[PDB]
């Protein structure tokens, strides 16, 4: 009733876009033709998982938040945490005493600093591509760090100026068999910053 | 009038707290009592989430209330399963 | 012999630093770096299970000359 993956790979120009269960679809050729375009996105992985989306963590800890640079440059966090720590030591007798007798002028800094941080110190953040899809990971493999290029921490730890000590053995040993398509600049493809290869 | 036998009150008091303030004070005191009993019992399975929820790492179970984790003491069979 | 024991490192060179050095040199499928229950610090030696035996051979032969965190990292077949 439906052909195998070899007939779908021979019929379509992109055999890598053919899925494992795409042959059981009603229109596998149309799905392969739609999946082979330049501006398509894959199905999110939760359709195969029994686990719900971002639900099965249940035991890990995370940092609360990282504020942007202009908000921390206004410095609202310091007296906000000071006010929270002062209110945490207060009693409820003191809480209704302050409720019936308020004390203003707590922060009272200006309007111009927040006006400058909203407008003059406004920085455009880092936004990902149109075809990006967040999943259960997508926060750890940030190397896409090129292969064939040592990191800056490993270059500083081994005393590599910007000549690593193992770069001569890497040049004499040729390309590595794990990444044959990776080209190391300076020794194999004659490299700005710590990324001295691709 | 009997000034020394009236019910006791002090000036600049602010009055009695409402139901919401008393409820959140009771919830904070229950959280403090649960943390005190956890630190007395020295149970390493208790964790606080980044969203602020009780979690049993030995059971891998979230808890809505403090007494939900206080009643999670099954946990012996899950501890024997997670021991190996 | 896909698994390779990588040692001769210090406390600055960790499992992520070894993973970055692997992504520079040769890919490792899995990492085994157990730690003690009292100290909980990286010893600098771990079992990197490579995706191929040639990657572990190139790690033991060619990549066993770097200075990981000041100490000379040595990769042996395991
Ligand atoms: Zn439990």
Curated annotation (Swiss-Prot), chain A:
Outcome of swapping residue 80 to K = Does not affect methylation by PRMT9
Where are the stretches annotated Required for interaction with PRMT9?
Answer: 1-93
Q: Where is this cross-link: Glycyl lysine isopeptide (Lys-Gly) (interchain with G-Cter in SUMO2)?
A: 35, 86
Where does the source fall among the domains of life?
Eukaryota
Query: How the protein is affected by changing residue 45 to K?
Result: Does not affect methylation by PRMT9
Q: How is it modified after translation?
A: Methylation at Arg-51 by PRMT9 is required for the interaction with SMN1.
Where in or outside the cell it occurs: the entry states: Nucleus; Nucleus speckle
Modified positions (Omega-N-methylarginine) are: 51, 58
Q: Which residues carry this modification: Symmetric dimethylarginine?
A: 51
Whom does it interact with, and what assembly results? Answer: Component of the 17S U2 SnRNP complex, a ribonucleoprotein complex that contains small nuclear RNA (snRNA) U2 and a number of specific proteins. Part of the SF3B subcomplex of the 17S U2 SnRNP complex. SF3B associates with the splicing subcomplex SF3A and a 12S RNA unit to form the U2 small nuclear ribonucleoproteins complex (U2 snRNP). Within the SF3B complex, interacts directly with SF3B4. Found in a complex with PRMT9, SF3B2 and SF3B4. Interacts (Arg-508-methylated form) with SMN1 (via Tudor domain). Interacts with RBM7. Interacts with ERCC6. Component of the minor spliceosome.
Q: Which disease appears in this protein's record?
A: Craniofacial microsomia 1: A form of craniofacial microsomia, a disorder characterized by a spectrum of craniofacial malformations ranging from isolated microtia with or without aural atresia to underdevelopment of the mandible, maxilla, orbit, facial soft tissue, and/or facial nerve. CFM1 is an autosomal dominant form characterized by mandibular hypoplasia, microtia, facial and preauricular skin tags, epibulbar dermoids, and lateral oral clefts. Affected individuals also present skeletal and cardiac abnormalities.
- The protein's name: Splicing factor 3B subunit 2
Q: Which organism is it from?
A: Homo sapiens
Q: Which gene encodes it?
A: SF3B2
From Swiss-Prot, chain B:
Q: Where is this region: Disordered?
A: 1-27
Q: Which residues carry this modification: N6-acetyllysine?
A: 10
Residue numbers bearing the N-acetylmethionine modification: 1
Cellular localisation: Nucleus
Tell me which domain of life the UniProt entry assigns to the organism this sequence originates from.
Answer: Eukaryota
Which stretches of the protein fold into Matrin-type zinc fingers, per the record? 54-81
The record describes the protein's role as: Component of the 17S U2 SnRNP complex of the spliceosome, a large ribonucleoprotein complex that removes introns from transcribed pre-mRNAs. The 17S U2 SnRNP complex (1) directly participates in early spliceosome assembly and (2) mediates recognition of the intron branch site during pre-mRNA splicing by promoting the selection of the pre-mRNA branch-site adenosine, the nucleophile for the first step of splicing.
Family affiliation: Belongs to the SF3A2 family.
Summarize the subunit comment: Component of the 17S U2 SnRNP complex, a ribonucleoprotein complex that contains small nuclear RNA (snRNA) U2 and a number of specific proteins. Part of the SF3A subcomplex of the 17S U2 SnRNP complex which is composed of three subunits; SF3A3/SAP61, SF3A2/SAP62 and SF3A1/SAP114. SF3A associates with the splicing factor SF3B and a 12S RNA unit to form the mature 17S U2 small nuclear ribonucleoprotein complex (17S U2 snRNP). Identified in the spliceosome 'E' complex, a precursor of the spliceosome 'A' complex. Identified in the spliceosome 'A' and 'B' complexes.
Q: What is this protein called?
A: Splicing factor 3A subunit 2
In the UniProt record, what gene is named as encoding this protein? SF3A2
Portion held of the full protein: 1 to 87 of 464
Swiss-Prot record, chain C:
Compartment(s): Nucleus
Where does the secretion signal sit in this chain?
A: none
User: Subunit comment for this entry?
Assistant: Component of the 17S U2 SnRNP complex, a ribonucleoprotein complex that contains small nuclear RNA (snRNA) U2 and a number of specific proteins. Part of the SF3B subcomplex of the 17S U2 SnRNP complex. SF3B associates with the splicing subcomplex SF3A and a 12S RNA unit to form the U2 small nuclear ribonucleoproteins complex (U2 snRNP). SF3B4 has been found in complex spliceosome 'B' and 'C' as well. Component of the minor (U12-type spliceosome) spliceosome. Found in a complex with PRMT9, SF3B2 and SF3B4.
Name the linked condition: Acrofacial dysostosis 1, Nager type: A form of acrofacial dysostosis, a group of disorders which are characterized by malformation of the craniofacial skeleton and the limbs. The major facial features of AFD1 include downslanted palpebral fissures, midface retrusion, and micrognathia, the latter of which often requires the placement of a tracheostomy in early childhood. Limb defects typically involve the anterior (radial) elements of the upper limbs and manifest as small or absent thumbs, triphalangeal thumbs, radial hyoplasia or aplasia, and radioulnar synostosis.
Q: What does this protein do?
A: Component of the 17S U2 SnRNP complex of the spliceosome, a large ribonucleoprotein complex that removes introns from transcribed pre-mRNAs. The 17S U2 SnRNP complex (1) directly participates in early spliceosome assembly and (2) mediates recognition of the intron branch site during pre-mRNA splicing by promoting the selection of the pre-mRNA branch-site adenosine, the nucleophile for the first step of splicing.
Q: Which family does it belong to?
A: Belongs to the SF3B4 family.
Protein name per its UniProtKB record: Splicing factor 3B subunit 4
Mapped onto the parent protein, the portion here is 12 to 89 of 424
């Amino acid at each position: 009733n439906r052909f195998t993956v070899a007939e779908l790979k021979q019929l379509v120009a992109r055999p890598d876009v053919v899925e494992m269960h795409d042959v059981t679809a009603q229109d596998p050729k149309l799905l392969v033709h739609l999946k082979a375009t330049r501006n398509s996105v894959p199905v999110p992985r939760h359709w195969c998982f029994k686990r719900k989306y971002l639900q099965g963590k249940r035991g890990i800890e995370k940092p609360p938040f990282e504020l942007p640079d202009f908000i921390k440059r206004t410095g609202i966090q310091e007296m906000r945490e000071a006010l929270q720590e002062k209110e945490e030591q207060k009693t409820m007798k003191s809480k209704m005493r302050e409720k019936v007798r308020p004390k203003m002028g707590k922060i009272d800094i200006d309007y111009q600093k927040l006006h400058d941080a909203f407008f003059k110190w406004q920085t455009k953040p880092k936004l990902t591509i149109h075809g990006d899809l967040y999943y259960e990971g997508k926060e750890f493999e940030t190397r896409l760090k090129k292969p064939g290029d040592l990191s800056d921490e490993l270059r500083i730890s081994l005393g590599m100026p910007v000549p690593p000590p193992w770069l001569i053995a890497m040049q004499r040993y040729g390309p590595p068999p794990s990444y044959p398509n990776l080209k190391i600049p300076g020794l194999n493809s004659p490299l700005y910053g710590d990324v001295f290869g691709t | 009038m009997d000034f020394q036998h009236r019910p006791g009150g002090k000036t600049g008091s602010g009055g009695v707290a409402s139901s919401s303030e008393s409820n959140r004070d009771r919830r904070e005191r229950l959280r403090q009592l649960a943390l005190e009993t956890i630190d007395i019992n020295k149970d390493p399975y208790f964790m606080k989430n980044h969203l602020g929820s009780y979690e049993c790492k030995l059971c891998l179970t979230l808890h809505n209330n403090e007494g939900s984790y206080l009643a999670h003491t099954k946990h012996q069979t899950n501890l024997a399963r997670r021991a190996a | 012999d896909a698994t390779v024991y990588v040692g001769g490192l210090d406390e600055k060179v960790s499992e992520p630093l070894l993973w970055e050095l692997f992504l520079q040199a040769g890919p490792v499928v899995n990492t085994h770096m157990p730690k003690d229950r009292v100290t909980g610090q990286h010893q600098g030696y771990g079992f990197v299970e490579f995706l191929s035996e040639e990657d572990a051979d190139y790690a033991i032969k060619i990549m066993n000359m770097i200075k990981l965190y000041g100490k000379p990292i040595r990769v042996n077949k395991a």
